[PDB]
Amino acid sequence: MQSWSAPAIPVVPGRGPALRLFDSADRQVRPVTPGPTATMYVCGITPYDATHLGHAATYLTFDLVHRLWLDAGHTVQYVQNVTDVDDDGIDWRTLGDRETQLFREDMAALRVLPPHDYVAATDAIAEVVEMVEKLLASGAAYIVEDAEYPDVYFRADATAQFGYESGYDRDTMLTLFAERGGDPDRPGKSDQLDALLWRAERPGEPSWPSPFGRGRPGWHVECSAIALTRIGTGLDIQGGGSDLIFPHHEYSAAHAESVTGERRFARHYVHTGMIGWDGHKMSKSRGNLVLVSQLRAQGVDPSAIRLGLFSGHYREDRFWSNEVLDEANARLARWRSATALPEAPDATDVIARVRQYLADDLDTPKALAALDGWCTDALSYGGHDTESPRLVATTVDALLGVDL
Ligand SMILES: [Ca+2]
Ligand SMILES: [Zn+2]
Q1: Measured by CB atoms within 10 angstroms of the end CB, which terminus of the chain is less buried, N or C?
Q2: Element (H, E) at 100
Q3: What are 20's strand-pairing partners?
Q4: What residues have CB less than 8 Å from 225, skipping those under 6 apart?
C-alpha cells in the first residue's frame, strides 16, 4: 500500500555510540543491538478518528530511531499498519480514505521517513486467519459457547509471562480493558481478560471467510500477524503511544509468543508520552484538537513543529502551547542564522555530543541545548572553519530531520 515520499538523507561522516532505549517491560534503559537489518513495527493510525499532534509526535520519535539506525549504517525494515477495521452518512471508506491521505501529507511535510511496508489491516486478513488456526490447534485459543456468535478468544493464561510487558495488576488491567476496547463481561468467556481473536459475523457488518466461521479479526492479532509475517521473531522494537501498553501491546505480544514459543515478541517495547493542550487531553469532544495541517495552514514551518516536540523528552507526557511554538521558531531562526555563516568554530565536539545524547534514550533536550550553544558561539565569536556551518546543517538534517 502507498505511503509517502522520503526526503533526501545526507550522510554524516564519522560515527557515534550505539542506540540505547528505555524498555517499558524491564523499565530500564538497555542497548538496542540489531542485526545488519534493524526491524521496527510502529502501530499506525485509525482513519475513523482525527490524527493529531500527539500521534505525529509518536511517528517523529521513531523517525529519530530510524535516522539513528541509518546513521550507524544499518539497513532498516520499518513496518507500519492502518487500523481500518471496525472504528456513517457517507460510506466509511470515503471519509476514512481522506484521513489516511492527509496523514501522508502531514508525514511528508514533516520529512518523516516512510515505512518500507505500509500494511492495511484489511490487506492482512489471511495472515490473521493463519495465526488463529495455530492458536486454536495448540489450545491457546477457544471458541466461546455461543449458538449464533461463535467468537474466538485468546486465553489470557496462554503465556506464563502474561503481564510482563505492561506491569499492571489485574484490576488495573480490567479497568483499562473495558475503556480501551475489551469485553470483560461478554458471557461465556473463561476469563474476563481473554482477548477476542475472531469476532463472529454480525448482521450488518462486513465479514471475511475463515475455517472457524465468517467474521472480522481482533485488533491485537492484526498487529501481531503483520509483524510476524513481515519481520519475524527478530523484532527489535515494538512501538507506539503509551495508551497501547495495555491492552494492545500486551495481547499482541502474548499472541505472538504463544505461536512462536519465543520468550519476547519484541526486544524493546518503546512508548511515547502524550501531547495535550491546556491541561487537557486532545479529542473531538473538547474541541481542543491541535492538528498538524492546522498549524501548516497557519504558516508554521514543519521543522519548527519537530523542534517544538523535540524540546521535550519523547517519554514525557507534556503539553503543546504557543510558548512552545515561539521557542521552536526562535530556535529554528537561530540555527538557520549560524549554519548560514561562511565560517564558524569547529563542530567536531558538538556533533559528537549530539550523537551521544541521541544514543542516550533519545535525549533531544540535551541535543537541542548543545546545538544552541554552538550556534551562540558561532554568532558571538565566529571561527575559521569554513565547513562546520554546513556540517552542522547536514547533521541536523540527517539525525533530526530538521531542514535549516
Ligand atoms: Ca555513518
Ligand atoms: Zn497496533
Answers
A1: N
A2: helix 94-109
A3: 31, 360
A4: 124, 127, 128, 130, 131, 217
Contact (CB, 8 A) for 273 and 314: yes
Q: Tell me which residue has cell 556540517.
A: 391
Binding residue numbers for L-cysteinyl-5'-AMP: 43-46, 58, 81-83, 219, 241-243, 275
DSSP 273-299: PPEEETTB---TTTT----HHHHHHTT
> Cα(first)–Cα(last) distance of the chain, in Å?
31
The ligand placed nearest to the CA atom of residue 11 is 1
d(CA 99, CA 132): 30
Report the separation in Å between the CA atom of 168 and the middle of ligand 2, taken as the mean of its atom positions. 19
d(Cα 204, Cα 183) in Å, to the nearest integer? 20
Using the structure block, give the residue that is written with the C-alpha cell 521558531.
329
The technique by which this structure was obtained is: X-ray
DSSP 43-80: ----TTS---HHHHHHHHHHHHHHHHHHHTT-EEEEEE
